[PDB]
Amino acid sequence: SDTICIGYHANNSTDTVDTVLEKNVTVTHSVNLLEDSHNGKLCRLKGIAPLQLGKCNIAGWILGNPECKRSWSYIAETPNSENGTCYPGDFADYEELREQLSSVSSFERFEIFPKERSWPNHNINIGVTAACSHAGKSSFYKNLLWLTEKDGSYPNLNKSYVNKKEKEVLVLWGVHHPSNIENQKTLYRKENAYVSVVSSNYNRRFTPEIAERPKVRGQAGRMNYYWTLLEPGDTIIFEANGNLIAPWYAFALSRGLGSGIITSNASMDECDTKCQTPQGAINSSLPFQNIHPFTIGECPKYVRSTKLRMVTGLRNIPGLFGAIAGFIEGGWAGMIDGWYGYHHQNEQGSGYAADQKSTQNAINGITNKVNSVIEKMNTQFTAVGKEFNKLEKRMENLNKKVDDGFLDIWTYNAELLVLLENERTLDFHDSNVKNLYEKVKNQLRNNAKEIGNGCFEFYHKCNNECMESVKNGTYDYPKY
Amino acid sequence: SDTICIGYHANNSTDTVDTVLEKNVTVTHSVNLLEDSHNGKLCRLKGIAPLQLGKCNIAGWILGNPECESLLSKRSWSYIAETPNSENGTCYPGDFADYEELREQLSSVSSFERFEIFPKERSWPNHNINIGVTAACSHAGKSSFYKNLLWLTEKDGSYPNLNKSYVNKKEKEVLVLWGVHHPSNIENQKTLYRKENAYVSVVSSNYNRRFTPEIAERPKVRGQAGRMNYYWTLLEPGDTIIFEANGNLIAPWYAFALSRGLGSGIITSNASMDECDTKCQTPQGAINSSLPFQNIHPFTIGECPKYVRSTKLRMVTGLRNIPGLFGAIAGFIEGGWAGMIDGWYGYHHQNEQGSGYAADQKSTQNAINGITNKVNSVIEKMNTQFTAVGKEFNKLEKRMENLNKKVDDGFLDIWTYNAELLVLLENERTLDFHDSNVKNLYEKVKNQLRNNAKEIGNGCFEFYHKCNNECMESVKNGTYDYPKY
Amino acid sequence: SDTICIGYHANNSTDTVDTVLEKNVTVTHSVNLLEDSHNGKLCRLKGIAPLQLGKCNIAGWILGNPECESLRSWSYIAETPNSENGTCYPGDFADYEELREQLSSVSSFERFEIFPKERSWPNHNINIGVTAACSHAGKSSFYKNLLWLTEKDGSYPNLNKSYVNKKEKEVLVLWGVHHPSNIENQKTLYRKENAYVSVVSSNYNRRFTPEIAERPKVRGQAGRMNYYWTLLEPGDTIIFEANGNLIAPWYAFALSRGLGSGIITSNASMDECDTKCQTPQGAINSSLPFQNIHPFTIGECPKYVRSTKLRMVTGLRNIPGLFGAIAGFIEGGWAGMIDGWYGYHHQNEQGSGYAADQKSTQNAINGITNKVNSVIEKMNTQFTAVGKEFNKLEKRMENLNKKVDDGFLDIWTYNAELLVLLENERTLDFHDSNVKNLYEKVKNQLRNNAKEIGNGCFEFYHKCNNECMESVKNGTYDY
Ligand SMILES: *[C@@H]1O[C@H](CO)[C@@H](O[C@@H]2O[C@H](CO)[C@@H](O[C@@H]3O[C@H](CO)[C@@H](O)[C@H](O)[C@@H]3O)[C@H](O)[C@H]2NC(C)=O)[C@H](O)[C@H]1NC(C)=O
Ligand SMILES: *[C@@H]1O[C@H](CO)[C@@H](O[C@@H]2O[C@H](CO)[C@@H](O[C@@H]3O[C@H](CO)[C@@H](O)[C@H](O)[C@@H]3O)[C@H](O)[C@H]2NC(C)=O)[C@H](O)[C@H]1NC(C)=O
Ligand SMILES: *[C@@H]1O[C@H](CO)[C@@H](O[C@@H]2O[C@H](CO)[C@@H](O)[C@H](O)[C@H]2NC(C)=O)[C@H](O)[C@H]1NC(C)=O
Ligand SMILES: *[C@@H]1O[C@H](CO)[C@@H](O[C@@H]2O[C@H](CO)[C@@H](O)[C@H](O)[C@H]2NC(C)=O)[C@H](O)[C@H]1NC(C)=O
Ligand SMILES: *[C@@H]1O[C@H](CO)[C@@H](O)[C@H](O)[C@H]1NC(C)=O
Ligand SMILES: *[C@@H]1O[C@H](CO)[C@@H](O)[C@H](O)[C@H]1NC(C)=O
Ligand SMILES: *[C@@H]1O[C@H](CO)[C@@H](O)[C@H](O)[C@H]1NC(C)=O
Ligand SMILES: *[C@@H]1O[C@H](CO)[C@@H](O)[C@H](O)[C@H]1NC(C)=O
Ligand SMILES: *[C@@H]1O[C@H](CO)[C@@H](O)[C@H](O)[C@H]1NC(C)=O
Ligand SMILES: *[C@@H]1O[C@H](CO)[C@@H](O)[C@H](O)[C@H]1NC(C)=O
Ligand SMILES: *[C@@H]1O[C@H](CO)[C@@H](O)[C@H](O)[C@H]1NC(C)=O
Ligand SMILES: *[C@@H]1O[C@H](CO)[C@@H](O)[C@H](O)[C@H]1NC(C)=O
Ligand SMILES: *[C@@H]1O[C@H](CO)[C@@H](O)[C@H](O)[C@H]1NC(C)=O
Ligand SMILES: *[C@@H]1O[C@H](CO)[C@@H](O)[C@H](O)[C@H]1NC(C)=O
Ligand SMILES: *[C@@H]1O[C@H](CO)[C@@H](O)[C@H](O)[C@H]1NC(C)=O
Ligand SMILES: [Cl-]
Ligand SMILES: [Cl-]
Ligand SMILES: [Cl-]
Ligand SMILES: [Cl-]
Ligand SMILES: [Cl-]
Ligand SMILES: [Cl-]
Ligand SMILES: [Cl-]
Known part of the structure; x- marks a missing residue:
């Protein structure tokens, strides 16, 4: 002790x-x-789950590039996501579109202008190009329709769509800008044409600018791509006498709040x-x-x-x-x-x-x-x-x-x-x-x-x- | 012890x-x-005090939407307060250029003075100054229009080219607003302005823009298939603004002399x-x-x-x-x-x-x-x-x-x-x-x-x-x- | 003790x-x-070292304001508070702040004649495009990097010029469009009431329409020139087409940008x-x-x-x-x-x-x-x-x-x-x-x-x- x-x-x-x-x-x-x-x-x-795009980017996917889910929480692209605008041109407000598509609670592709019934006096089945090839044959975007002249004329068109859904509709289209005056007349049978797209909020007129351009993917012509969001009850009206790359499919969707895009090998x-x-x-x-x-x-x-x-x-x-x-x-x-x-x-x-x-x-x-x-x-x-x-x-x-x-x-x-x-x-x-x-x-x-x-x-x-x-x-x- | x-x-x-x-x-x-x-x-x-807008938003107030009071006695404000019921804005549909920028720039002012830049009765002798109203901008059951703009139309079968300038002698910035009318069809374009192809040109020492009416049928908003785009600029003291047009000008009637305050903002509030x-x-x-x-x-x-x-x-x-x-x-x-x-x-x-x-x-x-x-x-x-x-x-x-x-x-x-x-x-x-x-x-x-x-x-x-x-x-x-003890 | x-x-x-x-x-x-x-x-x-501009700002230097010296790499740009030589002919400079930012750091940079003055424009007057708004040494002058073409012998033929970027670097191309004060000046310079200017590459694609109007005078001029630029990527081609009002490229710049620098305004x-x-x-x-x-x-x-x-x-x-x-x-x-x-x-x-x-x-x-x-x-x-x-x-x-x-x-x-x-x-x-x-x-x-x-x-x-x-x-x- x-x-x-x-x-x-x-x-x-x-x-x-x-x-x-x-x-x-x-x-x-x-x-x-x-x-x-x-x-x-x-x-x-x-x-x-995310939307995985793989070989495609958002442009290729949303336009329907021929080489390219009801909901998603973000979008994943790979560093090899090269399939986008196969026919060259400018994509309006592209970064804004990517941001707005980054999460959706509901998503539905639908035929906004049915190919076989909407365009009675135009040629609807030869608007293909080697720039947009698939499986060894010339093709085109699966969500757009390249109308061309029929029997020597390209009549004026006037086509509207009323969003009678309970969701926003994303509508996409393009305007073709030929490389030369001869291509313009072969496709659209007139030198000076116009495209007009109007809704309750959107209001734009496009005029083809013909010019010889440096070839991109073999094309000296250009196609500019455009989009807008149609609110429920709104109406979009297309008017053109040439050069319209018309909507074929559009997207009804509910946008989610604030997500983004990841580029990843995972x-x-x-x-x-x-x-x-x-x-x-x-x-x-x-x-x-x-x-x-x-x-x-x-x-x-x-x-x-x-x-x-x-x-x-x-x-x-x-x-x-x-x-x-x-x-x-x-x-x-x-x-x-x-x-x-x-x-x-x-x-x-x-x-x-x-x-x-x-x-x-x-x-x-x-x-x-x-x-x-x-x-x-x-x-x-x-x-x-x-x-x-x-x-x-x-x-x-x-x-x-x-x-x-x-x-x-x-x-x-x-x-x-x-x-x-x-x-x-x-x-x-x-x-x-x-x-x-x-x-x-x-x-x-x-x-x-x-x-x-x-x-x-x-x-x-x-x-x-x-x-x-x-x-x-x-x-x-004290005891001790 | x-x-x-x-x-x-x-x-x-x-x-x-x-x-x-x-x-x-x-x-x-x-x-x-x-x-x-x-x-x-x-x-x-x-x-x-702040600028309280109530039933109007900044677009409705600054353009002079007839449901918005002029509130001419407020000479200054340190911020803007809108309510969630601020719903009176552009009563005639169209695009308001750089609207968010304008809201930010109007958010505080040291002095503010609405004045008649182009007197209605003497500025437009050869145009119609009295028929530019719309049911889209109604007040008290009758058609009206913005109180700060003037919808000029043809007079006596013609819409002559106009050429009007304003020299800013207020020693302050002057905020000038205008619009361009885009009719729904060619018949209305010719009725109002007596020519198919018209132009509007607005130039100062720094601003330089040309507008051309875009005629098209649009889905009706507030009953209107036509459109009116709205534009603005800040004219620096001593500078001159010149309007030139042969149709489609929604001309300035009143403008605003103002001294902007630095960096305020807008609040949305029930208070x-x-x-x-x-x-x-x-x-x-x-x-x-x-x-x-x-x-x-x-x-x-x-x-x-x-x-x-x-x-x-x-x-x-x-x-x-x-x-x-x-x-x-x-x-x-x-x-x-x-x-x-x-x-x-x-x-x-x-x-x-x-x-x-x-x-x-x-x-x-x-x-x-x-x-x-x-x-x-x-x-x-x-x-x-x-x-x-x-x-x-x-x-x-x-x-x-x-x-x-x-x-x-x-x-x-x-x-x-x-x-x-x-x-x-x-x-x-x-x-x-x-x-x-x-x-x-x-x-x-x-x-x-x-x-x-x-x-x-x-x-x-x-x-x-x-x-x-x-x-x-x-x-x-x-x-x-x-030591004592 | x-x-x-x-x-x-x-x-x-x-x-x-x-x-x-x-x-x-x-x-x-x-x-x-x-x-x-x-x-x-x-x-x-x-x-x-930085790029010091002194009396000039970036617009005056890049366009070649005649009061500005022509120059290479730099890590940032220094302007003085007295940098007041810019666009001596009044007008708008497209995306000017963007350009200032993208020029703020370069690892190589060289001014070169993209369209030789003497032989690129055979049937236009190339040597009278000067103005009192851009005076130097008591004489009317003009930007040193741009060329104001005008009519010769009563006409301004269409032009159609391309340049291929073989520089193995980006090339900065600048140009202008002239907007005269009245139609008499439009006809005198360009023998044409309505003209066009077109500029296209693999990325860029724009068409310019001169607008005639009475404008308040700035540096004595009721006309305006708007200034434009694009970056030409290696191997790409730019094409200019016009029948009037073109302030054509004369000199352009081959450059390699550096990462994110900026501009300092300094008395130092x-x-x-x-x-x-x-x-x-x-x-x-x-x-x-x-x-x-x-x-x-x-x-x-x-x-x-x-x-x-x-x-x-x-x-x-x-x-x-x-x-x-x-x-x-x-x-x-x-x-x-x-x-x-x-x-x-x-x-x-x-x-x-x-x-x-x-x-x-x-x-x-x-x-x-x-x-x-x-x-x-x-x-x-x-x-x-x-x-x-x-x-x-x-x-x-x-x-x-x-x-x-x-x-x-x-x-x-x-x-x-x-x-x-x-x-x-x-x-x-x-x-x-x-x-x-x-x-x-x-x-x-x-x-x-x-x-x-x-x-x-x-x-x-x-x-x-x-x-x-x-x-x-x-x-x-x-x-
Ligand atoms: C979808 O993405 C793939 C992969 O990027 C694209 O395939 C690539 O297409 C380019 C252009 O056609 C090929 O480059 C070219 O190859 C030819 C060979 O004859 C050469 O002559 C050209 O100078 C150029 O190098 C590239 O090799 C090819 N890559 C692969 C792996 O196949 C495809 O074109 C895209 N398709 C669409 C519809 O967007
Ligand atoms: C390069 O920068 C200098 C420095 O500002 C410019 O000089 C300045 O030019 C203005 C306009 O010519 C001069 O103002 C004026 O004086 C005249 C009478 O002399 C009067 O009529 C005008 O109303 C105005 O008040 C200013 O004195 C002059 N300053 C100096 C220090 O010389 C020059 O114009 C610029 N040049 C180019 C090509 O950019
Ligand atoms: C000012 O705001 C009021 C309320 O937002 C607008 O009132 C309505 O008008 C629409 C169509 O004109 C009707 O469908 C609603 O029922 C009205 N609401 C009412 C009366 O409470 C009014 O039109 C606006 N006026 C202007 C000039 O902008
Ligand atoms: C912090 O501690 C005080 C003191 O213990 C807590 O108050 C007492 O908690 C007991 C048991 O939950 C209750 O019976 C008493 O009525 C509480 N006293 C009072 C004055 O409320 C108190 O709840 C503790 N707070 C937190 C956040 O832990
Ligand atoms: C160290 O102690 C831990 C816990 O007892 C044991 O897992 C381990 O075998 C010991 N020896 C080592 C880590 O060499
Ligand atoms: C397009 O068709 C609709 C269908 O009635 C018509 O009301 C409208 O006026 C047409 N557009 C033009 C520009 O004619
Ligand atoms: C993907 O993998 C390749 C090959 O290992 C690598 O070089 C690249 O940096 C990776 N990228 C990402 C985004 O992980
Ligand atoms: C140990 O201390 C506590 C008070 O701190 C006392 O109540 C308890 O009886 C003590 N234990 C013994 C074995 O004496
Ligand atoms: C604590 O004592 C103070 C003494 O003035 C008294 O005012 C207060 O009410 C007391 N608070 C509580 C919780 O007893
Ligand atoms: C105003 O009142 C509504 C009533 O529900 C409320 O939801 C809102 O948060 C209040 N404040 C603002 C700034 O709208
Ligand atoms: C701010 O402080 C004063 C005095 O300290 C006080 O009377 C007032 O209630 C306070 N305001 C709020 C909102 O609490
Ligand atoms: C107590 O402390 C003070 C502090 O200096 C000293 O002056 C004083 O002599 C001390 N003794 C008494 C009895 O106050
Ligand atoms: C403080 O001491 C240091 C080192 O001894 C000396 O260098 C310095 O001069 C002294 N400063 C003053 C104020 O005496
Ligand atoms: C410009 O020149 C090229 C080559 O000579 C030609 O292909 C093109 O058609 C010309 N452009 C015009 C508008 O004539
Ligand atoms: C800090 O203390 C020193 C030492 O006396 C004095 O000289 C100085 O003024 C003091 N500074 C402040 C801020 O009190
Ligand atoms: Cl431990
Ligand atoms: Cl501790
Ligand atoms: Cl205590
Ligand atoms: Cl501690
Ligand atoms: Cl402590
Ligand atoms: Cl020590
Ligand atoms: Cl310690």
Whole structure:
């Protein structure tokens, strides 16, 4: 019945964290705040799969490029999505259309102007081109119809469609611009033609501009593509005496709020996520991720960090208060049941025992600390990526300034928060051991000699009931 | 046996704060960092009332839709307020060029003066100035037209070419509006303007545009298959604007001399105007701006607290209320003293002359000063500027609308996280600071008493000698004369 | 009786810092985190000088305003506040802000004759297209990169000219369209009331119609010229067709663009200096995380803040708090201890002296160094041109850009101020802790062999010569 010692837990962990004052501190346990892995797959968002376009891009898909789902939560293109406008020309407000199609709750392709009945006095079946070939034969977009002259004339046409659905209708069409005056007259039998498209909101007149242009996909002519959204009850009216690439199929749809487009090598799998990146889906529980800036969903904040680890356990030794790695030089691998505690020796035996009160209080506090760093992060469904055309460089650079500024803010705060919390956590453990030592010293008083390494040497016999009284608050100083 | 004890203040407060290590800690006093209420009113900003539009929107008001009052007495405004029932706009259908840009540029004005740029009765001697009305723009059951525009038509079988200029001698910018009529058919074009091919030309030193009517049958909107597109420009002081046309001009009648204010915006609100002033207006009502954070609304106008999703941001200033790093408070000094009323930390003694409490004023006042500097830094370091958060985009600017949302949502996330974690960290430090001050007060006494007193272990010392009132005072004074005893 | 005391360093430093609990604490040493000065110079970014325009703006230089000099690569463009030579013939410059942005950084750049003046336009007058609105040296002149064709011998034949981009780079092609003030001038110049201009490539496709109208005079001209441009990709062809009103390309530019730079408006002057961050006032050092010189920087820059002082204490509070030692039971500091931060003063029969505790001081120096390095080195930055230019119909974009910059300004100012306050409080508590722990190490090492005096000193009950004193300072004292 000579001694009782205060000490702390150690184990065989080789985890390291950084603190304010020192790098690479080995600790008994740590927790990761940084999502640093992905599953390499395209997953469902809001329980709905993406639209995978594969070899096609949105232009090729929506026009019906011959080489190219009721709902989708985002759109996925590949880096080999090259099938788009097979006949060359300009696609009006293309980036805006991509954004507006990025999520739809309902989607239905339907024959807006039935090919065989809408155009009685035009040739409806020879508007094909080698620029739009499929299976070794010349073809054309499957959603448009290239009307041409019949029996030496191209009569004026006047065709309307009233959206009598309960949804928006996306209508697409084109205007052909021949390379020379001879092609104009062969196809449309007049030199000066017009195309007119009007709705309640849309109002435009197009005039073919004939010019010899550098050949693209073998074509010196051009076809410009146009679209509008018809609200329920609205009417669209087409009028032309030439050069019209008429709607054949259109799309009734309900647009979803705010998604986006991913360019990715990943393929779809049976997985659900809250956050999709171009590399793959990631978990959304942690506050930070270093996978990719251009995510879609309710996502961790993107950071440039490679490591964000919070210590939960102790400095591992198999601070401000001078106890841990101070006057108590090392930890106890033999104390397996807690963080701080006792070792004793008397005539009845020896052994380690954790102080459960201080241990459990400290566990509760460290768990509340980690939970706060994680759960205070507020998130919303956001599609980070944005697309800008060659005449929107200023907007593209403003968007980048926004993404990069957020990246800089979150990287700095996340790194410094982890360093600061890790410093506080080790001082907290140091304080708890220090306060445990003083509780014992103040009970024992002059009935024991302080050795100076955390241990006390009793001047009387301290049996097991006496030892238990010291771990309890109730040591009976005068009784000895 | 005579005794002296070290202790700390407790009261009947039920304030709670959160810390890093523990939630819902009851404390003796705390302060709020979050503006969480509004007054439900539209208030003046920079001392100037907003422009209230009511049943009209900006298009209806600025063109002079006959259902919109002219409101000619308002010379200035600091922001614009529309209601969700602001439905009177372009009564004759058509496109309003750069409408969102115009709304943004009209959102605050230092001075504003509607004046007759082209007097109806003398500017158009060879055109009809009296038949340009429409049932689409009716008022009081009769056909009418915009009060600031003039729909000229042919007179005596002809619509001669017109050539009209205006020199801006108002020493301010002049906002000029006009329209171009696009008839539904060729018969109406010839009826109104007596020629199939007409043009409108509008030129200044910086503006230069030519308009040609586009004749086509459109689906009827407000009964009209024709269309009217609306256009505007800001004419700089001293510059000249020249209109030339041989048909289809919806000519300016009234224009606006104005001095634009810098960077305000438009609010959509059910709230009504009151005789109140604010530094920060939200769509539900005005909020105070002394505190760094607010959770009322993201789309504020003025010098505003930062928007956060937090519901509670309370900093403890006082102590753990018990009616940790240093082990004194809720440690070896188990509870506080509701009887010590005069400070945060102090003493209780008992000798033959009596017993009682006494606060240590030096440590208390030093702690009050530090906590005050702490709270002031959290509040006063917030830099703010006059900003109108909200932005409006048309149906072909969805990418811009979403970029704007990404900015607003990103700031919301940054400020919510940083505010929550800052309060947690400050609260933990504040409680550690109090704990330290009590511990250091205890050690100052223990080191003077040395072995002339027995440590009990609950903050108290038991003297081995008689410690009269002068002896007690010397201990609190620091000037205890150990050799004497 | 012999004595050893524990104490801490003091000096003659007048540096002050702010802490959480108190302002204006005098400390023995501190480090600055805020760039508050510049060198008043325009320096090279990425090792490449800027393009200085001086009296000219980008329109005047790219079109070849005759008061503008013709020039090659650059990392950013510098305009002066006196840059007032642009389009000397009045008109509209299509997508001018876009062009300014896309020209702001180029890795190669060369002016070349795309359509030789002397032989490209055989049946037009090529040498009388000058105007008093573009005078130089007392004579009517014109842009040096464009050619104002006019009728010859009573007609302006149709023209039909193409250029194929064989340059293995993009080619910037500029042109204009003339809109005369009246029909007499239209006929005199172009012998034609109604003309057309057509310009087409693989990407570009536009047709221009001259509009005749009376307009208020600008630089004496009631006519206008509108200016246009496109980027011709390698291997592509541009084709011009017209029967009037064409201000034809004469010189164009083969160029390779660089990534996102911008334009600085500056009173500063070029010098032979390199920088990583350029402000309109001058170049700034980019080692520190924060700067208060200017919001609109170009390069890899410190974050812009409103702060006027961001000093971190590294040393001790200077006395010539959580742990109660510094300015506590050890009331003041020792200016006589010159070799470290914490240490000893002894006195015995052999004399007196101060000696730092080297183990304590070195661990503290390493910790404080790591603290300062983390605040500086964790700052992530990228090459960014902050400034943007918007025209008069882009005020919403201008205000959104301002909301971005002001938002970042408020975030970084608040965080930097509060970070420094918190770091400084912890640094001062760290030093306090280190002095207390050193004091306790000696106290428990001596136990009842010495008496505690109360000021950090112990009085020995026995003779403690120099070896004895050394054993205490070394930890090897044997009671
Ligand atoms: C759909 O996408 C595929 C893949 O991009 C397109 O196939 C590619 O078509 C181009 C143009 O026809 C081919 O390039 C050309 O090849 C010929 C060979 O005779 C050469 O003479 C031309 O100078 C040029 O290099 C390309 O090789 C071909 N790639 C593959 C893998 O087949 C296809 O044309 C697209 N189809 C539609 C309808 O959009
Ligand atoms: C290049 O930039 C210079 C600097 O602004 C231009 O010179 C300025 O030209 C204006 C217009 O010619 C001058 O203003 C005028 O003075 C005359 C009488 O001298 C008066 O009739 C006008 O009403 C106007 O007030 C101005 O004095 C002159 N400034 C200087 C410093 O010379 C120059 O025109 C530009 N040249 C080109 C080709 O861009
Ligand atoms: C914070 O703690 C206080 C004090 O315990 C809580 O208030 C008491 O909670 C008990 C048990 O739920 C109730 O019986 C009492 O009526 C509560 N007191 C009062 C004044 O309401 C309080 O609910 C806690 N708050 C949070 C958010 O945890
Ligand atoms: C001003 O706004 C009112 C309300 O929006 C318009 O009122 C309606 O007119 C339409 C068609 O003219 C009717 O279908 C509605 O029933 C009317 N609502 C009523 C009377 O409450 C009014 O036309 C607008 N006037 C102008 C000039 O814009
Ligand atoms: C370390 O301890 C863990 C837990 O007891 C055990 O899994 C492992 O085998 C031990 N030895 C190592 C990792 O070498
Ligand atoms: C197109 O046909 C409809 C059907 O009645 C007719 O009302 C309309 O006037 C026609 N459009 C034109 C321009 O004639
Ligand atoms: C896709 O894979 C190829 C080949 O490994 C690689 O070069 C390319 O960068 C990848 N792209 C994406 C978006 O992952
Ligand atoms: C341990 O201490 C508590 C009070 O802190 C007391 O109620 C309990 O009886 C003690 N246990 C023993 C075995 O004495
Ligand atoms: C607490 O005491 C103050 C003393 O003035 C009193 O005003 C208040 O009502 C009390 N509050 C409670 C909850 O008892
Ligand atoms: C703003 O503060 C004043 C005085 O502190 C107060 O009277 C008013 O109620 C506050 N306004 C709101 C909306 O809470
Ligand atoms: C106005 O009242 C309606 C009634 O439901 C409500 O939905 C709306 O949020 C209120 N505020 C605004 C700004 O419309
Ligand atoms: C108490 O402290 C003050 C502070 O300097 C001192 O002047 C005084 O002499 C001390 N003693 C008494 C009895 O006041
Ligand atoms: C302070 O001391 C340093 C080093 O001893 C010396 O260089 C400096 O001149 C001194 N300053 C003053 C004001 O005495
Ligand atoms: C800070 O303290 C020094 C030392 O007396 C003084 O000279 C200086 O004016 C003080 N500054 C402020 C802002 O109080
Ligand atoms: C321009 O020249 C090319 C080649 O000589 C020719 O093919 C083309 O038809 C010409 N354009 C016109 C409008 O004559
Ligand atoms: Cl552990
Ligand atoms: Cl903590
Ligand atoms: Cl209080
Ligand atoms: Cl801290
Ligand atoms: Cl603090
Ligand atoms: Cl120093
Ligand atoms: Cl620290």
